[PDB]
Design a protein around this ligand. Structure first.
Ligand SMILES: CCCCCCCCCCCCCCCCCCCC
Ligand SMILES: CCCCCCCCCCCCCCCCCCCC
Ligand SMILES: CCCCCCCCCCCCCCCCCCCC
Lengths: 164, 164, 164, 164, 164, 164
C-alpha cells in the first residue's frame, strides 16, 4: 500500500521528470558551448547534467520507499542556442530558481497534508538549491567583471573546465 | 568547417538522440522492476541506462571532432509496464536489434559517401552491439529454462543486482 | 528549570515507553520464530529489538537536555504467537506505522506550542521510520513471492540471519 | 520435544522475565541519577542494565537449547526515585541478593528432579551473582566512608562513569 | 538580485551582530574570571567566545549566498563584573536562552514569508542552542553541588580549562 | 598587586580595545569585498581580522601577567563601504599607520616611567607593525600598476585568497 497520497506522489513524480529535463537542458547548453569552442564551459555543463540526474534518482528512490512508483514522461526539446556565454548562464539561473520554486510547492503541498516524511525529505533539496543558485550567480558575477575580455574568459573556461 | 557531410552529420545526430532514448527506455524498465519488487533486475537496468549514455556521449564527441554540432531533440515517452520479467527482456532484445540495424544504416551511408573516418568510428558500436544483444539473449535463455520458478528468478535477481 | 512544557515532556516520555514496548514486542516475535525453528528470522528480530532500544535512549537523552526527566512505566505483555511468518511481519509493519503516527502527533503538538527544538529533534525519527517501514515492506514482498516455497524461505532465513 | 520438565521450564522462564525487570530497574535508577545530575552513576546503571539483558538472553538460549519455548510476560513499573545515591545502591544490593536467592531456588528445583544439565548451567549465574553483589557492597562501603562529602562523591561519579 | 526579503536579511544581519556581542560578552566574562584567578574558567570563556564567532560567520556566509550583504553595527559595552562564579554562569545561561528565542523569532518570520531556505538553514542553530544551553546548565549543576568548596571548585577549573 | 602603573595599564587597556576595533574594521572590509564579489580579497581581510584578535589577546595576557585587569569597552561601528578595492587598502594603510603611532605612544609613556618590562614587551608590536604596513604598501603598489585592469585584479584576488 502506498503511504503517500496520490497527490503527493504525482508532485514528486512531476519533479523527477523536471530534474530529467534540467539535466537535458544543461547537456544542450554544453552542445552550445562546444559549438562555440569553449570546452571548459561545456565540461561544466556536462558535469551539471550528471548532478541533475542524481537529483532525479533521489526522488526516484524516495517514491519507492513510500510505496509509490515512477512513471517517466516525454522530455520536451530544450533550446539549443543562446546569445552568448552570459545569456546561457542567466538562462541557467532562471531555470534553477524555477526548480527551487517547484520544490517549494511540493513542500507546501506535503505540509498541508501533514506528510511530515515528505516535508523532511525535501529539506536536502531546499539546501541544495541554495548551492546551485549561488554557483551560477558567482559565475555570472565573474562574467560581468570579465566584460568580454578574452584573457579573462580563457581563465574562467579552464577553471570551470576543472570541475570534478 | 565541418568535414562530415550534412547527411552523415544528421545520421550521427539522429543516433545520438536514439541512444538517449535507449537509456531512457532502460530507466523505464527499472521503474517497472522496482514497482514489482525486483531490485536486482532494476539495478541491472539502471546500469544499462548509464552505459547507453556513454554511447550517446561518444557520438557527441565524434560529431564535434569532425567540426559538426549536436542538436538535442525531444524524447518520446517510453512504455512504463511490461508483462513480467521475461516480457521486458524480450522487449530489450528487440530494441537492441533495432539499435544494431540503425548503426548498420549509418555505416552503409558513410561507406557510400566514402567517409572512411565515420565508417571506422562505427566499428566500436558494431562490436558493442554484438555484446549487448548476447547479454540479453543469455538472460532470456535462463528465463526460458527457469519457466517462472521463483527459486531460480531470485538467484538471477541478486546476480544481476551485482553488476557494477 | 525545564524548558519543554510538561505537555511535550509527557508526549516524549510516552514515546520512550512506546519504544521500550516495541523492543519487547520484537523480542517476543523472536521467541515465536525460535519456537518455529527459524533462527535467521529470530536473529533479525533480536537485532531489531536492540535498534528500538537505541531509539528509546535517544528520547531519553533529549528529555534530560531540555531539563526534563524520564519516568519508566509498566510494559504490557506482548503477543507471543502469530499464524505464520508473514502474519508476524505484517504485525511488525502495522506496529511501525503506528509508531510513525505517534511520532507525527508529537511533532504536531510541539509545532503548535512553537517548540522548534523538539520539532527539529523529531526529524531524525521521521526519516528513520521511513527506513523501518520500508525494510518490513521489502521482507513482506519477498515472502509473498516465496509463496511458502521452503527452498526460498530457507534463503531468506539465512539472509536476514546475517543482519549485523 | 522438550527435555526439561515443564516445572523447570517455567522456573527458567520466570527467571528470564526477572532478569528483564532487573535491567528495567537499573535503567530506572539511571533516570534517577540523571535527574539528580550524576552522569557517572547514571552511566554505571545504564551499563548494568545492559549486562542484565545478556543474562536474560542466556536463559533465553538455554530454554530453546533444551527444546522449550520462551513466553515474555508483563513488566512491572519500577520505582523511579530514591532517597539519594546511597539509598539507590542499598536498593540495588537488596535486589541482587533477591536475584541470587531466585537462582538458588531454580538450582534446588533442578537438583531435586536430577536435571543435571540445568544444575550445571546455573553455576555461571551463581558465580556471577557473587561478583555483582560484591560490586555493590564495595560501592556502598565507599559511600559510607564518604559520609556525603561531595569531594569524594564527585571522584566516584567520574570513576563509575568510566565503566565500559 | 537578493532572493531573501529585506525583512529576513535584516533579521539575519541583526542576529549576526548579536553573535558578535555574545562573543564579546563571553570574552568579558573571561576578563572577570582571570581577575579572580580562575584560569580554567577564563579559558572556557575564551573558547566559548571563539565558538560564538563561528556562529556569526555562518550567518555571514548564508547572507551572501542568498544575495544579501552584511553590515556590521556598533557593539555595546558588556558587563565586566559578576558577584561570583555561579552569577556569571547564570548570566551566561540567561543570555543563551535569549539567543535561542532570537533564533526562534527569525524562524517564525521566515516561515510566515514561506522562505523555506532560511527556515531550513536555521535548523542547525536550533540544535546548537540545545547543546549550548545544556552545557551551561550542567556547569551550574556542578557549581550548586560544589557549594563553594574550593577543593571541588579547583577540579572544575582544571576540568573546564581542558576544553579544546 | 598591580606592578604596572594605572597610567600604563590604561594605555595598554586602550590599545587592547583598539586592536579589537582593528579586527572589526577588517571584517567590515571583508563584508564590502564579498558584497562586490571579490572572495579572495574578502578572505585576506578575514584572516587579517583573525590576526588582530591575536594581537588583542597578547595585550590581554600581558596585562594580567603584570597584575592588572582588562575592561572591554564599546566598539564603534566601522565603515561598511569603500570606493573600490584600492580605496579600501588605502584606508587599511592609513589605519595601520595609526595603530603604529598608538604603539609608539605607549612605548614613550612606558619609557618615561622607566617601565622597562612594558617597553620590552612592546618591541614585538613595533616590528610587527613594520610587516603589516609593508604588506599593505606592497598590495597598493601592485594596484597602482594594475590601473584597474581586471586581468591583473583577478590574479591578485586569487593570490590573496590563498592566504592561510
Ligand atoms: C563528460 C560527462 C558527460 C555526462 C553526460 C550526461 C548527459 C545526460 C543527459 C540527460 C539524459 C536524460 C535521459 C536519460 C536518463 C538516464 C538516467 C540513468 C540513471 C542511472
Ligand atoms: C542476540 C541479540 C539479543 C538482543 C536482545 C535484546 C532484548 C531487549 C528486550 C527489551 C527489554 C526492555 C526492558 C529493558 C530495557 C533496558 C535498556 C538498557 C539501555 C542501556
Ligand atoms: C585563547 C583563545 C582566545 C580567543 C579570544 C577570542 C576573542 C573574541 C572577542 C570578540 C571580538 C569581536 C570583534 C571582532 C570580530 C572578528 C571576527 C573575525 C572572524 C574571522
Amino acid at each position: 500500500m502506498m503511504v503517500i497520497s496520490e497527490k503527493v506522489r504525482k508532485a514528486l513524480n512531476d519533479q523527477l521528470n523536471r530534474e530529467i529535463y534540467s539535466s537535458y537542458l544543461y547537456l544542450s547548453m554544453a552542445t552550445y558551448f562546444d559549438a562555440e569552442g569553449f570546452k571548459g564551459f561545456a565540461h561544466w555543463m556536462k558535469k551539471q547534467a550528471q548532478e541533475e540526474l542524481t537529483h532525479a534518482m533521489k526522488f526516484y528512490e524516495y517514491i519507492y520507499r513510500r510505496g509509490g512508483r515512477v512513471e517517466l514522461e516525454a522530455i520536451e526539446k530544450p533550446p539549443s542556442n543562446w546569445n552568448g556565454i552570459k545569456d546561457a548562464f542567466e538562462a541557467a539561473l532562471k531555470h534553477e530558481e524555477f526548480v527551487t520554486q517547484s520544490i517549494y510547492n511540493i513542500l507546501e503541498l506535503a505540509s498541508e497534508e501533514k506528510d511530515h516524511a515528505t516535508v523532511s525529505f525535501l529539506k536536502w533539496f531546499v539546501d541544495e538549491q541554495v548551492e546551485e543558485e549561488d554557483q551560477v550567480r558567482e559565475i555570472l558575477d565573474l562574467l560581468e567583471k570579465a566584460n568580454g575580455q578574452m584573457s579573462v574568459i580563457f581563465q574562467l573556461d579552464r577553471y570551470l573546465g576543472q570541475r570534478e
